[PDB]
Predict the structure.
Amino acid sequence: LRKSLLVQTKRRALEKIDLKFIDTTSKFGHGRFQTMEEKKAFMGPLKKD
Amino acid sequence: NEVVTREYTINIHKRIHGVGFKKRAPRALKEIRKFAMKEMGTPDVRIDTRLNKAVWAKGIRNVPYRIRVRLSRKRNEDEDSPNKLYTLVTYVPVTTFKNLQTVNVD
Amino acid sequence: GMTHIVREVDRPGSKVNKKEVVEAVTIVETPPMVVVGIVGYVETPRGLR
RNA sequence: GUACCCAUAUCCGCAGCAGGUCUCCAAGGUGAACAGCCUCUGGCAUGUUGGAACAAUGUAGGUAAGGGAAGUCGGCAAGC
RNA sequence: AGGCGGCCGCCCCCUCGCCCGUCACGCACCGCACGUUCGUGGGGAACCUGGCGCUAAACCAUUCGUAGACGACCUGCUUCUGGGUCGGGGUUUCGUACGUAGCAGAGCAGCUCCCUCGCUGCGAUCUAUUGAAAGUCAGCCCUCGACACAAGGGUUUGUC
Ligand SMILES: [Mg+2]
Ligand SMILES: [Mg+2]
Ligand SMILES: [Mg+2]
Ligand SMILES: [Mg+2]
Ligand SMILES: [Mg+2]
Ligand SMILES: [Mg+2]
Ligand SMILES: [Mg+2]
Ligand SMILES: [Mg+2]
Ligand SMILES: [Mg+2]
Ligand SMILES: [Mg+2]
Ligand SMILES: [Mg+2]
Ligand SMILES: [Mg+2]
Ligand SMILES: [Mg+2]
Ligand SMILES: [Mg+2]
Ligand SMILES: [Mg+2]
């Protein structure tokens, strides 16, 4: 990760961003759920219990 | 110098991947020989007719995914090879595959 | 790996403004760097030595 | 005269050559069918080599969002 | 693109470390060149001697995939926080496995306690067990659960 050798504004650098949602769906395939607690609360009980 | 005997659950479905249909089942035999040579240590590997039937029971391309095997190491006599020990791989049938692991057999 | 970000855009004069934007965003794991060595350089008339 | 081949190896083609050469016998199922496919009697080791990986390019096979011949001399090929 | 020079405290000697003058000698090799030099000139293999020190690293093999036509490149290998193989889970792909039971089921056939859904047998499917069963890294993640494996070899490499 190399620092930029020139200084530019361009209305593209140095703007305060606001993050809202970062998805953590299943990337090994098609993702359906966000968190493990949400997945277990949606699917309910199975043969694992 | 031991004469030991151990059971195994080889996974041919994850030891063969990307092999064509007309050569999928013969690669399983070389993979079983390589697995026996790696685990037991001797180069001489002899597999049985029951294991031959268990591998080739479903053709050339529908290779069974997991096979329960038993490996016995014995010595050779009567003008033996330079490799005195040899692994005699035999087949044992089992209905299920879950919660099965390597078992030393007396 | 790569994930999404739902991001608020504070860039005036656009259709993008005041709306959520989903972007393709990578993740780079960076462990801290343990300092080991110091190297000095001399300006030569062929470069740096 | 009476052996044997009668053939993708006993014939011809310079050869154990995807070439050519005249005939009889013909099962079960699906099926209109001696069509195509899978089995039985009967033969065979894949056709003058094997092992390892699956790069470019090629030879044969299959697909591909939207447009449907706008490419090309021509719907050539492929597909409905 | 550096290794010789300058200063101070001492060191064993030298007041001929140089020019002017006197004296006697050293090969005077008897006419002959390539002579005197920065030379204790540069490099290689060894020989006998003193002191001070050093105790490795590549390549193959095997494994690996972030890499590959073959070479080549990035990697692992300790007997304890090492790796490998099974198994366990996490993820996912497909869509509800065999067996069991049904007062579900187009109906059909058989029997008589002539039975007020009487009973049995065949019967595409359906229902509960069933978000079930099956595969899941060979190029997915974690495992201190179980097994053995581990310094085990072949080739090569030194600077007055
Ligand atoms: Mg005859
Ligand atoms: Mg011919
Ligand atoms: Mg012919
Ligand atoms: Mg017929
Ligand atoms: Mg008919
Ligand atoms: Mg006929
Ligand atoms: Mg031939
Ligand atoms: Mg198309
Ligand atoms: Mg389409
Ligand atoms: Mg059209
Ligand atoms: Mg038109
Ligand atoms: Mg034209
Ligand atoms: Mg045509
Ligand atoms: Mg079509
Ligand atoms: Mg089934």
In short: The interface with chain A takes residues 1, 3-8, 10-11, 20, 28, 30 of chain C (CB under 8 Å). Strands of chain C lie at 2-8, 20-26, 43-44, 47-48.
